[PDB]
Ligand SMILES: *Cc1c(COP(=O)(O)O)cnc(C)c1O
């Protein structure tokens with residue numbers, strides 16, 4: 004039947020579980036005390052595998068805004084943004100994004116996945132081009148699949164291939180170059196300055212995703228593009244509420260005069276309910292605090308540098324030479340080594356994000372650590388000691 | 401540039417606004433007192449254009465569950481369901497759905513749109529078939545577009561065309577027939593008993609969307625399929641948290657033994673954050689109350705019958721001869737008549753959902769009313785008096 008196609012995946016899963024490893028796709032956070040602490044399988048555990056970069060999910064102002072919105076506006080809107088679903092707090096969250104990015108336009112979607120799906124498929128039509136990194140987020144590829152444009156993949160992280168591929172396209176048709184500021188798999192940074200220069204040389208519009216940089220890159224926390232001096236040069240910035248902001252939702256911001264007309268045509272905007280009042284209320288409060296959360300930014304980067312430096316010095320192969328983001332990826336030689344490390348860490352009281360094929364390319368096996376502004380120095384050292392113990396026991400170092 | 405394609409839509413919008421009508425796509429609920437009352441443009445307004453069918457968004461148990469989850473688990477998970485994003489309340493909401501539908505399997509997505517997008521594109525692959533009503537929800541079509549299957553549209557509401565089109569397909573390949581229990585545009589009901597019999601005659605699996613029926617059709621509130629005696633015959637049921645349940649989210653339930661393996665392969669499940677703790681907590685509480693909300697069900701149907709009967713008797717052309725759902729669609733002769741009615745109702749203190757092309761087919765112009773369990777008899781009569789006044793002033797009756 005229709006599910007027979009999953010027999011291989013089912014057998015692969017059972018093979019993994021035959022090794023005695025905890026099912027990595029069924030972890031449950033039974034309790035979550037803070038941004039950095041949970042209870043998993045009854046064990047107190049340090050969280051080092053979340054995108055709660057700025058610790059906003061337990062910020063007292065954020066929590067209070069959510070509770071107040073539940074009380075005042077109820078649990079949901081029961082309507083789309085095109086009909087009855089735009090409440091006070093939806094207007095507030097779009098304004099918060101305008102203020103955060105310094106843009107005249109802001110369109111909020113129910114998820115980041117849907118923002119990418121919708122904006123890519125709506126902006127570029129038949130006879131037009133979407134140009135993207137080969138290893139772009141699934142939602143960006145799904146946006147391409149949803150639309151009718153010509154898709155132009157370029158070699159991962161290659162300014163040269165972007166330039167050459169763009170240069171061979173016909174000059175007249177409109178073009179969208181889609182870039183990510185931070186590459187989430189290894190936690191390295193895109194050469195946006197150089198790539199945007201190339202895009203503009205070829206007359207393309209540019210969309211940059213700043214999901215993994217929000218609140219901690221650039222003077223205003225706007226992202227890698229801001230840090231690299233590209234303010235005013237980026238046509239569209241896409242992002243999410245599910246990482247630094249600490250809830251769910253997606254968005255696109257722009258200064259283009261016709262931008263908010265996208266609402267009239269964008270299927271993933273139109274054909275879904277708007278977000279719950281409490282979600283857009285917590286997002287508004289969080290976004291506004293993220294404009295100036297300097298103490299948190301400082302702690303986040305201090306923690307990232309300490310973890311990155313410590314793991315590198317201990318003998319782990321890292322995805323990056325220098326600490327360039329809040330993701331630190333440990334690279335292992337094979338799937339077994341990654342699973343054994345991950346299990347030892349878990350059993351010892353530490354959660355990190357394992358990544359193996361097909362999540363990663365064949366031959367790449369990772370423990371992806373992500374830092375929080377609210378990790379303490381003691382926690383980061385506890386983590387390093389845990390990696391030392393696990394690495395020695397498993398034979399990685 | 402990329403936005404020049406919207407010049408026509410922008411001109412169309414300005415033409416509409418030149419008539420002096422309030423922008424129907426920019427309505428803001430400044431305050432929302434209850435499921436049935438809001439403040440719009442500073443005016444106290446009865447809401448008669450929401451999908452809050454069972455009034456659950458202000459249920460005190462629902463609200464309390466959301467507040468408690470914010471306090472205990474924070475504003476968001478900052479991770480996917482495949483990694484760090486499955487908290488206690490995510491497991492709770494999936495179990496609530498199992499209990500609600502009497503199924504062994506339940507997979508929750510971040511929106512109903514994404515549940516349809518994902519389940520359709522993941523279940524049916526190359527060489528297989530998705531068979532759907534010509535006027536299916538956008539998300540169902542988008543699921544088809546996202547996948548690699550052969551798409552087979554059948555004439556709207558035609559058991560005969562479903563049968564004939566299915567019969568011409570090759571017998572061996574697996575097939576998914578996708579049906580909706582309630583047709584949302586006019587509020588009529590699908591002939592599921594007959595269509596499912598046809599699907600099974602041709603050996604197809606069946607997916608039914610019960611978004612517009614949840615909690616008020618069938619003995620257990622499971623939907624039109626349950627009301628029509630099809631318990632145990634439906635392979636997959638898809639739904640949403642954004643209507644009766646009163647928050648955001650999507651889901652698919654099934655008794656198929658391999659079903660939850662869908663999680664391993666479904667892109668809109670994998671590549672997005674899980675829902676906020678408060679969202680899955682309010683949904684759990686709401687879903688469980690909806691299993692036995694008999695007083696509300698009774699009120700909802702009483703209100704629907706009173707509104708449907710009243711509008712019909714007053715001389716409005718309705719989308720349905722009998723009151724078959726909680727949607728009552730008033731059909732107007734042209735766009736101007738619909739807009740004038742909608743504006744008169746709005747100015748007089750009533751919000752309904754206008755629908756004009758391209759939301760509707762060319763030549764169809766609607767005021768779509770939707771009933772709530774928490775509308776009072778006085779409110780329903782107030783609404784009827786408002787329709788009488790508006791209809792007389794505009795010249796519709
Ligand atoms: C996180 C992320 C997304 C998805 O965001 P959600 O809001 O979790 O759906 C999409 N694209 C990129 C580049 C991301 O980093």
Ligand SMILES: *Cc1c(COP(=O)(O)O)cnc(C)c1O
Nearest residue numbers: 275276511512513537611640642
């Ligand atoms: C409401 C509805 C959807 C979308 O649900 P959301 O949760 O609002 O995204 C999808 N399909 C059908 C048939 C619906 O009725």
